[PDB]
Amino acid sequence: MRPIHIAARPVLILTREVVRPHLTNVTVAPITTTVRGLATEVPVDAVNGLNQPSVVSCDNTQTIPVCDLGRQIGYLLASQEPALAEAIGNAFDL
Amino acid sequence: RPIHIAARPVLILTREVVRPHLTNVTVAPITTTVRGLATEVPVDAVNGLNQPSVVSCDNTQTIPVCDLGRQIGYLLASQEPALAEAIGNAF
C-alpha cells in the first residue's frame, strides 16, 4: 500500500485506493518508532520509505480528512499485505 | 493564485510546486483597508475580485489546507516583481 505523511506523522493508507478520490476522508494507520512487539504491529524500516526502524500501529487506526493528508513518502511491499491483514485481524479479533 | 480561507481573501505565497505535497500553506491576507506601505501589493478587480484592495505582506500567515476555500482571482505576472520586492522590503 501507500505510506503518506499526515498532520505530523507517517501513516499507512488503509482505505482502498479505488474510492480514494471519491471521498473527503481516508482511513490510515499511524507509524511510531516505539515498537512494543505486538500482533497489532507491522514492522517497517527505511526500505518502506521511512528513515528509522518503526512499526505500523493497527491499534490506533484513524480516519482523517484528505486536506490533512500530505506528501507520499514510501511504499508498503506487497509481500507485507498478509501480515497487515493479520495485524488488523488480531487487533479486532478476526 | 489568490484563494479564500479563514475568513478573508488571501494570496498564496507558497510555491505552487509543493502545494499538493503539503498539508499547510503560507499565504498573505488581503484587506480593503489600505495603510499605504512598501509591504503592500495593490490588487483590483482585474485580479478577480471586484474591489480595490491590498495584499498585506507584513501579516504573512501559514495555515492548514483544511482552512483553504474557493479560488477567487489571479495575480498578473507584472505585479509579481513588486511582490518579490515587498517581501524583500518586509523582511
Residue A14 has phi, psi (to 5 degrees) of -85, -40
Provide the 10 A C-beta neighbour count for residue B33: 7
Of A49, A81, A70, A18, give the one whose Cα is nearest residue B64: A70
In whole angstroms, give the CA distance from residue B21 to residue B16.
Answer: 9
In whole angstroms, give the CA distance from residue B50 to residue B61.
Answer: 24
Q: Containing H/E element for B83? A: helix B80-90
Domain ranges of chain B: 1-91
Is the Cβ–Cβ distance between B73 and B9 less than 8 Å? yes
What does chain B come to in residues? Answer: 91
Residue of A71, A72, A73 to mutate, testing the B interface (most B Cβ within 10 Å of its Cβ): A71
User: Resolution in A for the shown PDB structure?
Assistant: 3.2
The correct CATH number of A1-94 out of 3.40.50.1980, 2.30.30.110, 3.40.30.10, 3.40.50.970 is 2.30.30.110
End-to-end Cα spacing for chain A: 21
Q: Containing H/E element for A91? A: helix A81-92
CATH number for the region B1-91 comes to 2.30.30.110
How close B65 comes to chain A (CA, Å)? 6
Is the Cβ–Cβ distance between A42 and A58 less than 8 Å? yes
Of A35, A27, A33, A58, give the one whose Cα is nearest residue A46: A33
How close B38 comes to chain A (CA, Å)? 34
Distant-in-sequence contacts of A61-65, Cβ < 8 A, 24+ apart: A61/A14, A61/A27, A61/A28, A61/A29, A61/A88, A61/A91, A62/A27, A62/A28, A62/A29, A62/A30, A63/A25, A63/A26, A63/A27, A63/A28, A64/A6, A64/A11, A64/A25, A64/A26, A64/A28, A65/A24, A65/A25, A65/A26, A65/B66
Of A9, A16, A1, A22, give the one whose Cα is nearest residue A69: A9
Contact A65 B66 (CB under 8 A): yes
Chain A residues with beta carbon closer than 8 angstroms to that of B17 = none
| Experimental technique used to determine this entry | X-ray
Of A35, A86, A25, A32, give the one whose Cα is nearest residue A60: A32
- A82: helix, coil or strand? helix
In whole angstroms, give the CA distance from residue B58 to residue B38.
Answer: 10
Secondary structure letter of residue B33 according to DSSP: -
Of A41, A45, A12, give the one whose Cα is nearest residue A29: A12
CB nearest B65 (choices: A5, A8, A67): A67
